[PDB]
Amino acid sequence: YCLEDALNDLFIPETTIETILKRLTIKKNIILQGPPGVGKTFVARRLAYLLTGEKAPQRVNMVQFHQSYSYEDFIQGYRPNGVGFRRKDGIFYNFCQQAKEQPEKKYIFIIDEINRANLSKVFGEVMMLMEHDKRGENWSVPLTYSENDEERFYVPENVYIIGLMNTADRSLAVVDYALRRRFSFIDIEPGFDTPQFRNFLLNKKAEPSFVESLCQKMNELNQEISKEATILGKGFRIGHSYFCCGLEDGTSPDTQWLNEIVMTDIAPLLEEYFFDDPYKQQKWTNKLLG
Amino acid sequence: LNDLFIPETTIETILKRLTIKKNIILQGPPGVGKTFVARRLAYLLTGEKAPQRVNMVQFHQSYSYEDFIQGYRPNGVGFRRKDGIFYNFCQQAKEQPEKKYIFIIDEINRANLSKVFGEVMMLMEHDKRGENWSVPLTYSENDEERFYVPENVYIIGLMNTADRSLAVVDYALRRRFSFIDIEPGFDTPQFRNFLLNKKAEPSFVESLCQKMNELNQEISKEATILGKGFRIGHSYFCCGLEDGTSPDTQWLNEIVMTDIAPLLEEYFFDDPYKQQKWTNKLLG
Amino acid sequence: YCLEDALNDLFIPETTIETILKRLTIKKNIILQGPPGVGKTFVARRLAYLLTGEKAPQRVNMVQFHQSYSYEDFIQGYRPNGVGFRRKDGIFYNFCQQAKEQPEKKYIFIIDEINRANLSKVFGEVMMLMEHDKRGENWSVPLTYSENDEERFYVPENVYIIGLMNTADRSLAVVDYALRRRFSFIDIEPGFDTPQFRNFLLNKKAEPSFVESLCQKMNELNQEISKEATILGKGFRIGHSYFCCGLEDGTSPDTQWLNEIVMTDIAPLLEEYFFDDPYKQQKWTNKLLG
Amino acid sequence: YCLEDALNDLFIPETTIETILKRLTIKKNIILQGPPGVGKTFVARRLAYLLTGEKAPQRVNMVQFHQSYSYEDFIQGYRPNGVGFRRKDGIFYNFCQQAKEQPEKKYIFIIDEINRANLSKVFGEVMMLMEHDKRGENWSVPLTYSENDEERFYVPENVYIIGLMNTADRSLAVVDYALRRRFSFIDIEPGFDTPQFRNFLLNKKAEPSFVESLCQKMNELNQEISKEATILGKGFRIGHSYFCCGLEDGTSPDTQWLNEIVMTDIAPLLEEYFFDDPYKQQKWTNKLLG
Amino acid sequence: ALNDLFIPETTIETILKRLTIKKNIILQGPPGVGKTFVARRLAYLLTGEKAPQRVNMVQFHQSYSYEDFIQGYRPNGVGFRRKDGIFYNFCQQAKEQPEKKYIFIIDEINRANLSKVFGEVMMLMEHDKRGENWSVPLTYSENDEERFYVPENVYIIGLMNTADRSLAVVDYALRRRFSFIDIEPGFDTPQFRNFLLNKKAEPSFVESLCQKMNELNQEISKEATILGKGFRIGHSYFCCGLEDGTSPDTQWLNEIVMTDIAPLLEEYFFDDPYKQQKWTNKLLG
Amino acid sequence: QPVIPVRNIYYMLTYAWGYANLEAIPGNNLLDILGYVLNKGVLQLSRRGLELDYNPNTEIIPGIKGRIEFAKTIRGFHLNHGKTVSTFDMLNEDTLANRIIKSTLAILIKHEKLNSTIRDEARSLYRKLPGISTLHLTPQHFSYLNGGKNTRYYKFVISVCKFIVNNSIPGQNKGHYRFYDFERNEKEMSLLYQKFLYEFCRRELTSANTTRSYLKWDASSISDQSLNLLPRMETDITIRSSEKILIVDAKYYKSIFSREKFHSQNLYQLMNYLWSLKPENGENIGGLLIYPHVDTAVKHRYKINGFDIGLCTVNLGQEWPCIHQELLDIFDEYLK
Numbered sequence A, C, D: 001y002c003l004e005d006a007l008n009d010l011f012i013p014e015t016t017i018e019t020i021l022k023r024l025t026i027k028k029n030i031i032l033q034g035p036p037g038v039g040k041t042f043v044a045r046r047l048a049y050l051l052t053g054e055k056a057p058q059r060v061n062m063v064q065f066h067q068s069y070s071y072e073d074f075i076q077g078y079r080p081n082g083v084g085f086r087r088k089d090g091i092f093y094n095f096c097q098q099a100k101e102q103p104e105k106k107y108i109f110i111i112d113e114i115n116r117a118n119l120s121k122v123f124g125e126v127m128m129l130m131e132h133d134k135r136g137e138n139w140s141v142p143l144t145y146s147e148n149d150e151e152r153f154y155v156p157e158n159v160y161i162i163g164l165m166n167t168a169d170r171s172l173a174v175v176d177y178a179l180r181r182r183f184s185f186i187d188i189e190p191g192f193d194t195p196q197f198r199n200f201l202l203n204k205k206a207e208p209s210f211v212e213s214l215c216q217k218m219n220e221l222n223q224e225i226s227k228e229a230t231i232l233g234k235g236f237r238i239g240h241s242y243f244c245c246g247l248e249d250g251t252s253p254d255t256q257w258l259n260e261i262v263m264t265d266i267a268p269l270l271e272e273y274f275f276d277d278p279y280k281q282q283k284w285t286n287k288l289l290g
Numbered sequence B: 001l002n003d004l005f006i007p008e009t010t011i012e013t014i015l016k017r018l019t020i021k022k023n024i025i026l027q028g029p030p031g032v033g034k035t036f037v038a039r040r041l042a043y044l045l046t047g048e049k050a051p052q053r054v055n056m057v058q059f060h061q062s063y064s065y066e067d068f069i070q071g072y073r074p075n076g077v078g079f080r081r082k083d084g085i086f087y088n089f090c091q092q093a094k095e096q097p098e099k100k101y102i103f104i105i106d107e108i109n110r111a112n113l114s115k116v117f118g119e120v121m122m123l124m125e126h127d128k129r130g131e132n133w134s135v136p137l138t139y140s141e142n143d144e145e146r147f148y149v150p151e152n153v154y155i156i157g158l159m160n161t162a163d164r165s166l167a168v169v170d171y172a173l174r175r176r177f178s179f180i181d182i183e184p185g186f187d188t189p190q191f192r193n194f195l196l197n198k199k200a201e202p203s204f205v206e207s208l209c210q211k212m213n214e215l216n217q218e219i220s221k222e223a224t225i226l227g228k229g230f231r232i233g234h235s236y237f238c239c240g241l242e243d244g245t246s247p248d249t250q251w252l253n254e255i256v257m258t259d260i261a262p263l264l265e266e267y268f269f270d271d272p273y274k275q276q277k278w279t280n281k282l283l284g
Numbered sequence E: 001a002l003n004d005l006f007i008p009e010t011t012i013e014t015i016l017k018r019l020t021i022k023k024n025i026i027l028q029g030p031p032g033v034g035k036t037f038v039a040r041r042l043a044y045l046l047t048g049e050k051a052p053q054r055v056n057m058v059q060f061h062q063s064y065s066y067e068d069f070i071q072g073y074r075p076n077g078v079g080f081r082r083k084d085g086i087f088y089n090f091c092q093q094a095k096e097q098p099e100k101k102y103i104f105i106i107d108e109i110n111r112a113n114l115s116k117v118f119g120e121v122m123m124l125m126e127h128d129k130r131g132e133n134w135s136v137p138l139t140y141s142e143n144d145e146e147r148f149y150v151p152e153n154v155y156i157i158g159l160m161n162t163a164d165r166s167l168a169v170v171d172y173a174l175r176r177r178f179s180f181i182d183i184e185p186g187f188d189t190p191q192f193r194n195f196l197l198n199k200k201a202e203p204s205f206v207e208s209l210c211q212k213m214n215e216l217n218q219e220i221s222k223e224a225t226i227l228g229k230g231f232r233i234g235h236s237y238f239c240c241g242l243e244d245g246t247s248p249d250t251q252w253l254n255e256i257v258m259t260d261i262a263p264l265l266e267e268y269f270f271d272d273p274y275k276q277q278k279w280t281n282k283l284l285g
Numbered sequence F: 001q002p003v004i005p006v007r008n009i010y011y012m013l014t015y016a017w018g019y020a021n022l023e024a025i026p027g028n029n030l031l032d033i034l035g036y037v038l039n040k041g042v043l044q045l046s047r048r049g050l051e052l053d054y055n056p057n058t059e060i061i062p063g064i065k066g067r068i069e070f071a072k073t074i075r076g077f078h079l080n081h082g083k084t085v086s087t088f089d090m091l092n093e094d095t096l097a098n099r100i101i102k103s104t105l106a107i108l109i110k111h112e113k114l115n116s117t118i119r120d121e122a123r124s125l126y127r128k129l130p131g132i133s134t135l136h137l138t139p140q141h142f143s144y145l146n147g148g149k150n151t152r153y154y155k156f157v158i159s160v161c162k163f164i165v166n167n168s169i170p171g172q173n174k175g176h177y178r179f180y181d182f183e184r185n186e187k188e189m190s191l192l193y194q195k196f197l198y199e200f201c202r203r204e205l206t207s208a209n210t211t212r213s214y215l216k217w218d219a220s221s222i223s224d225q226s227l228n229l230l231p232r233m234e235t236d237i238t239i240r241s242s243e244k245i246l247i248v249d250a251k252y253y254k255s256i257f258s259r260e261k262f263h264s265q266n267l268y269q270l271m272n273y274l275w276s277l278k279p280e281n282g283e284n285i286g287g288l289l290i291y292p293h294v295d296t297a298v299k300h301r302y303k304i305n306g307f308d309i310g311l312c313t314v315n316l317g318q319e320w321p322c323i324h325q326e327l328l329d330i331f332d333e334y335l336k
């Protein structure tokens, strides 16, 4: 794999990407936080091949957390084989064993929607081990279901973990500050006002005026949302994904196309953001259309 | 396309939105034919009236990821991993890639949709469908065996707008789902034509639409408490007249006490006079 | 092993380290409470070598409590065999058998994030027995899953227990005051003020002016944090672990490095910390850059 | 078993120990209800030898309750063999059986931390027999797991039950219904303002006025605890055993030794108590230091 | 049976118009309305053949679950076997006789969680989605060879009571699938007075007593919040004690005042002995 | 029986708890204001999302969920009838904090004297929270929540909920409730005012440093070092700045609201605080007495015993911003 392969279709600046790869080599654990629709899931599979430098999915594992996800499934626990119960080494436990075989090559474990599941319960023993300075046999730990103290589990040094956490829901947030220290948090923005996003549109037979008009609209729109941090922080603001997909047929992005998409998706979305003000909903809708 | 009481624009909108985006939520009050819309619509997209492709379920607060996708459940001998329907269903559509298989989701609002779907909450989006985006599930013993939604799958969810829950709002799922409202359609000729094609009186039909619309506008009057989402559907009128009993004010007045009155009670709770007024308004 | 080797790099005052030994040797169970990043995990492995007087891990055991540890895992529980269950002595019971094999040499059992789990549920019978007074054969007691033939389990005198309760999660704090009497709680400060912290940076090619500039700012922030008690208490104040790491290659500390720290880790932390007005965030973030 | 060995060292007034012996012969099911650090566990071991009048371990049994403790272990239950299930007589069942052989001799069962487990889930059916009036073979009952109704269990009149319950948690405002009817609660004072506690310090080369100064602070502070009911009732107040411990060397009491206790036990305990008003912590901490 | 029923004839006839079409129904009312006896006679009325075999009855509670109701695994001497529940057995029995209407009684329905018990089936019982088209594989039905569908003939009755103020607003699940009917106590009804006048009761004693209770039922419903229309007392107690062989009399009434109404009146108010004493004494005379 | 206009009172609570347009509501009385705060306040939480805390559940189910507890499993023999004892984490809004809101709303509706709109809207909201379980509230429940894991916003409404429950009295009927006559008693009004200033001064007087200071008597006693009999003396507030320190004692009196004799009994406490207090910095010593007045504000200065002391009043009922302006004008004079 190579760097330039990713950047061709990526709307995020390279400078942030350099910051991303810089920390991850150091901290070995990262979390990318932004609103939905900015390619967190998109980059994460790409970024892995960058860090390894080779397109190996064997070395990469990608999972999505949720409420009913637990230490027993993730790490270790007793589960039914059949008539007889057995201890089933979870996916993360097995992932490290593969990585142990190949210490040189980096192995990556990717957690989508991390903030949902109770991470404190899930990681558990891992919460201490995963830190960059504590990896290796020297900090070996026995697990809950380990037969004895001698059976011990150590995270390899090579492992890199990437977590994806939306900023739309304040209920589900990584409030456990001890857990926050392990992860280096990298905010991501929609990146409307970028050449790469614009070049993709112009590449898709788009008017230079209409594209630039659109960028002002969303950028100003997001700025209004970020202002009222009491109700809605910057994390809530709209992503670029609604505009990204759906143009595969070859339809040029005219104003008629824009008027359609806002009607179906953004309009009701705005209603919840501004429940009390119908005028404010009507104001911003009309601003895009006019 | 004949007995549907919704305008052709909405159904024409839906198929273009559905085929492209591949996920939709049809939200409206009870009695607007959400089931009949979805079930008819599914047969259009396949092009054949094949129900085996189509599967419908009705969510409820106690439904869980154990049932939907995967789960550990007992056989006679002991415990095993039992494939939930959607795991079972996508495999079925994966069997035949060309044809279009449909999954219908009723009473979606009740359950914590994130909790149920879990892993597939990412996978369902149209771009992220295929082996490349496959992931091992929670209960999969080995990482190598994975689950991926195929491109052929299309999903429809039917949502009641009249029972708002101030518990969990997810705007990320809203990114996956393209939302479509449905109006009751009293104004539509197609509902009126059916009544005129059931030997109804012309004035009685015109009087009927005015009666419900005046109430419907009142329901949407106070946006804070209630909205267009609460307003009454037409479907109560569809049933019970196929025996041969043509419409009459007596039959309507029965429905007023039979069906509408609890709804009024439910909606205009602790307000007898307004129910008494609006109930009596229809009878007059 | 001796104090001289351990305290070569450690940023803690000598006062606490000996004061720790004063309370521990009489009382034998302690908890060190501080925010994450103050070397709680770091010292604990080192302390084991002092009291034993030698660097041996065998007399030491290290574990972490993840809100799913149970008495079945800690002490006595039932595990599947091929077809049917058997009784398995847990790690702690296994640990005491080794420790009571020789009373002379001291044995340590270490519990990270001890505050999380419901300790009354895990320890059970031990909650009385851990205490210094009620040790030895005199206070032997029969366990829950003990055999009908009378066999009793007693904490040997040589055992010393250390707990590591982070001060971030207020909810996950010891409110079972009966248990809080078994332990002696030793507060650990962030560790900024000490010169022993300062020497570590200066030895790694750092200007004292830049060092003294940095430390002045942190205490003001922690003072700003220390003032509030509603949400952000005294304990939340920032640790020094962030600054410890990332300098091994030879990269000397500078505002570029500090700027990476401030934007990347601390700045997300601050907005979560305050989450009332951004103005408070921008001021203190900019102070560090200034 | 002479009283002078037993009762002289004790801090409690002779009024309460005698009263304890009265109800214990009468009712045989007794609960000592007080905060931690007043010797609840301490007295009960001595009292058992007092009533029997001799030092015999077999006639006296000790247990601590916790959530995992159950009927199946306590009384009777099935423990799996390699595959098959064998019935097993539990402790309390086995304990009384010894008392049957020697009916004259008094037998004692000691239950620490009783509130943690529901009495019904553990005792269950035997709560019928456990009552003081309905004892003896007349009220015999066949057990749940008995193979036939012929086999029966009756609580012999000779056994007396002692249960140690701590008023240290807010949940205990809803006391279990089972305890109130069948047990006789006794309140145990903290016992600072007592003659024998004072003389113990004086015997360990302590200034009398400083001790009297100390007691007024404890007596004054504990009064502040008692006045509140919402957060801290009378039952939460400090016990007298922090100061008892730690003098086995002969080290004289002083402000430094006091400060060791204050910083390491009582100060952080107060942080948990008086969270809402940090200054209220400051108010008392400085008061004690003086 | 029609004249034997004490409630208005209009209510009796109206229900069958609802049930035949809607196929799902719930009666919410005070205790002592003959709700159990009502449904049975109404169930026999719909079939017309007075067959108890067609009708099956179940009483819900919080523990009642999908395994009791539908299907589950039950222990053998060794191991365990799948054990058909009531409703699964019930419908398959009715499957043989399509023309024959079969009725199911779920008592104290509001106590249990409808979702927890039914599960999958909770949509299949709604009349719009019925029959083989809407077949679904069951939770423990490992194979896809056989699916569970309730045939059209099935009618579902739910017995709920409006007695308790502790009960909060009804579950949303119920409201969609059920038609809600309230049954009056029926004191005013002639059929109840002819059930006392046929037993040689004095018309004054009859009319006074009907007037006596009506004033009581009106006052208890006067409360807006704590005591609603549903609280007011039913008539079934008056049946109990007369047709065994003992004639009506004021002393017989006097026992019933002490028997049920006096403790019942205590339950509803549960605050004031004087107000209870006023009514309890007033009922006697 | 003249008292402060009620709308202004709510602002004083804001500073009291340390954290909107009140013109919109037409009901002058307090519960109309406070009920509208909660009824509108709940809506802000729901939009962002209510707190969801993972509560572990150990129950008997027909399958494996999370971690099986082997001990309880075999002891109940649930394996044979196809059941397991397993511990798992349902994610609910059933927290103690959220139950308080729903239980509180019942009390708000049950209050006998209330605006119709307020009672109507909440009953829907009461209906809108089906999963949560009603509770019978006591202060001990609020006491348990002093940990404050919840957000800063949650603590605001709960602080209001604490106020309402304590200031709720049963009225005409057994079921319904009646609001407390908070205004009439000075003591609760007084403790509010003292608390109102103490947290207020932290906000606005960023220039100065503000702390409550405990003081110890200059006395020595042959009898006791404790001096327990001597009164405990704790300042209401001290607002120290580099140039000048200042101690304030403020209280709410009904007689002073009357424009005759004057109630300055608290002044006896104030001087004695000055004497036992000795400043290490030795910049200056100043004193202030401030009381609530209704009609107008008057300021005086004194040179009493070598100390520079001010007695002043504030025209409550005027306007909230000018009152906010009024205090800053006030303290600046004496803080000098």
Ligand SMILES: Nc1nc2c(ncn2[C@@H]2O[C@H](COP(=O)(O)OP(=O)(O)NP(=O)(O)O)[C@@H](O)[C@H]2O)c(=O)[nH]1
Pocket: A009, A010, A011, A012, A034, A035, A036, A037, A038, A039, A040, A041, A042, A043, A164, A165, A166, A240, A241, A244, A245, B122, B127, B172, B175
């Ligand atoms: N072609 C292209 N698509 C992009 C780019 N960035 C984002 N997208 C698209 O936006 C959609 C969502 O990506 P995703 O990472 O899941 O967004 P997200 O922020 O993670 N969403 P969520 O947080 O809700 O999971 C996909 O269609 C993705 O390909 C891009 O740079 N190029």
Ligand SMILES: Nc1nc2c(ncn2[C@@H]2O[C@H](COP(=O)(O)OP(=O)(O)NP(=O)(O)O)[C@@H](O)[C@H]2O)c(=O)[nH]1
Pocket: A128, A133, A178, A179, A181, C009, C010, C011, C012, C034, C035, C036, C037, C038, C039, C040, C041, C042, C043, C112, C113, C166, C240, C241, C242, C244, C245
């Ligand atoms: N070299 C050196 N590193 C220190 C010192 N103190 C802390 N650190 C470093 O800071 C990092 C984390 O320390 P750690 O003990 O895990 O803190 P913790 O309190 O245990 N973490 P947590 O509270 O999250 O469990 C490690 O790199 C540790 O070595 C110190 O005095 N010297």
Ligand SMILES: Nc1nc2c(ncn2[C@@H]2O[C@H](COP(=O)(O)OP(=O)(O)NP(=O)(O)O)[C@@H](O)[C@H]2O)c(=O)[nH]1
Pocket: C133, C178, C179, C181, D009, D010, D011, D012, D035, D036, D037, D038, D039, D040, D041, D042, D043, D166, D241, D244, D245
């Ligand atoms: N010498 C002496 N020691 C006492 C006396 N009272 C209590 N202690 C000491 O206090 C220490 C703990 O007593 P203990 O009974 O365990 O208190 P507890 O009620 O069991 N504690 P908890 O409630 O936490 O379980 C022991 O050293 C005990 O001997 C006393 O009167 N004399």
Ligand SMILES: Nc1nc2c(ncn2[C@@H]2O[C@H](COP(=O)(O)OP(=O)(O)O)[C@@H](O)[C@H]2O)c(=O)[nH]1
Pocket: B003, B004, B005, B006, B029, B030, B031, B032, B033, B034, B035, B036, B194, B233, B235, B236, B238, B239, E128
């Ligand atoms: N002919 C016709 N029937 C309709 C229409 N809408 C609903 N119905 C019928 O109304 C009955 C109930 O529909 P249902 O799905 O339960 O209502 P909903 O789920 O709340 O939308 C079915 O017979 C529907 O087919 C319609 O537009 N035209």
Ligand SMILES: Nc1nc2c(ncn2[C@@H]2O[C@H](COP(=O)(O)OP(=O)(O)O)[C@@H](O)[C@H]2O)c(=O)[nH]1
Pocket: E004, E005, E006, E007, E031, E032, E033, E034, E035, E036, E037, E236, E237, E239, E240
């Ligand atoms: N014969 C006859 N008995 C009735 C009638 N109505 C109620 N009953 C009797 O009243 C009793 C049932 O009352 P019910 O309310 O169902 O008892 P509950 O379920 O405990 O409330 C039985 O004795 C019924 O036969 C009726 O109309 N005719």
Ligand SMILES: [Mg+2]
Pocket: A036, A037, A039, A040, A041, A042
């Ligand atoms: Mg995404």
Ligand SMILES: [Mg+2]
Pocket: A128, C040, C041, C042, C112
């Ligand atoms: Mg640590």
Ligand SMILES: [Mg+2]
Pocket: C128, D040, D041, D112, D164
């Ligand atoms: Mg004890």
